[PDB]
Each structure stands twice: as C-alpha cells, then as structure tokens.
C-alpha cells in the first residue's frame, strides 16, 4: 500500500491522474519524482521549470554543479539528484525533444530509467513542450516500465483523451 490517491489504474503497474505534478509531489513526498529534463539540466519551462520554481531554484543550483562536474546527460539518459522539498530524490530523465529533431525511438530508452526505481511519480516523457504525441508516450511507458509508476497529467482535456483512447 502507498499514499497515492485518486489514480485510475491502467495496467498492473501504471496509474494515471489529472494532477499538477508539483502539487502532487508536495502532498505525497514520494521517494522519486521524475523531471522532464534536458541534457544540460536547464530547467526553464514545462515540467522542469515548474519543479525548479517550486524548489526556489535550488534544483537549478544543484544541477549546475552536476553539469560542471559531469558534463551533459545523453538523450535517453538520466541522473539521480535531490528531490529538495518535493521528494526524497529527483530522477532527471531526458526524453527526445521533437522540436530539436531527436529520434523518437530514444523514448523507450528514456523510460527504461524508471525501472531502476520501485515506485515513481512522473510526467509523460517527451510530452508537452518536448513535442511528442502524449498518446504514444503513454503507450511506450506501459510497454517499457515494469516498476510502479504514477503518471500526473496537468491538462484535464489531455488526461480524458489519454484515458478514453487507452488500449
Ligand atoms: C504552478 O505549477 C506549475 O507550473 N505546474 C506545471 C507546469 C507545467 C507542466 C507541464 O508542462 N506538464 C507537461 C505537459 C503539458 C502539456 C501537455 C502535456 C504535458 C506532459 C507534462 C504533464 O502532463 O505533466 C506541469 C506542471
């Protein structure tokens, strides 16, 4: 049993809710919140910008030190950093950004990072300002992630479309 509430069950291991991931993280304090990161960990907008704003820019400060030491992530890759006031840990995962021309096949590699964590609160990778089709992202999630994932979808209209079209 865990503290996630109000989710619709899509599969054995994938759950979905119309929710602001910032507000959900603040209430649940999950072990892992996933950030929709880019390779530079520049958290300017979308989910990343919202998560970073909620940390009062501490996420960005930590991320800048990470990049200065380690260099950029790979598209499809991830790193574990602090969850600050939102979670124990933040798993920064880089899905391909279609608005930069990155290969959508890398979306499966991106979701594979979730399998290193037993339970996660996450957005749909490569959705929103990353330009992929969220219905496709949900399909890849369900077909790739085997650990327990709680998906937060900010837009109610999109949430309803994701549920109604789910196979
Ligand atoms: C004040 O609080 C906040 O700013 N919160 C906040 C701000 C932005 C986003 C976001 O860009 N989300 C992504 C988004 C947007 C449109 C379509 C698909 C998706 C996938 C992501 C999701 O559905 O979560 C999420 C939360």
Curated annotation (Swiss-Prot):
Its UniProt entry gives the catalysed reaction(s) as: Thiol-dependent hydrolysis of ester, thioester, amide, peptide and isopeptide bonds formed by the C-terminal Gly of ubiquitin (a 76-residue protein attached to proteins as an intracellular targeting signal)
What is the annotated localization of this protein?
Host endoplasmic reticulum membrane
Q: How does it sit in the membrane?
A: Multi-pass membrane protein
Superkingdom of this protein's organism: Viruses
Q: What is the effect of changing residue 31 to A?
A: In strain: Mu/B.1.621
Provide the Macro domain boundaries: 1-167
**Reported regulation of activity:** Inhibited in vitro by GRL-0617.
Function of the molecule: Responsible for the cleavages located at the N-terminus of the replicase polyprotein. Participates together with nsp4 in the assembly of virally-induced cytoplasmic double-membrane vesicles necessary for viral replication. Antagonizes innate immune induction of type I interferon by blocking the phosphorylation, dimerization and subsequent nuclear translocation of host IRF3. Also prevents host NF-kappa-B signaling. In addition, PL-PRO possesses a deubiquitinating/deISGylating activity and processes both 'Lys-48'- and 'Lys-63'-linked polyubiquitin chains from cellular substrates.
Subunit structure comment from the entry: May form homohexamers. Interacts with N protein.
Name of protein: Papain-like protease nsp3
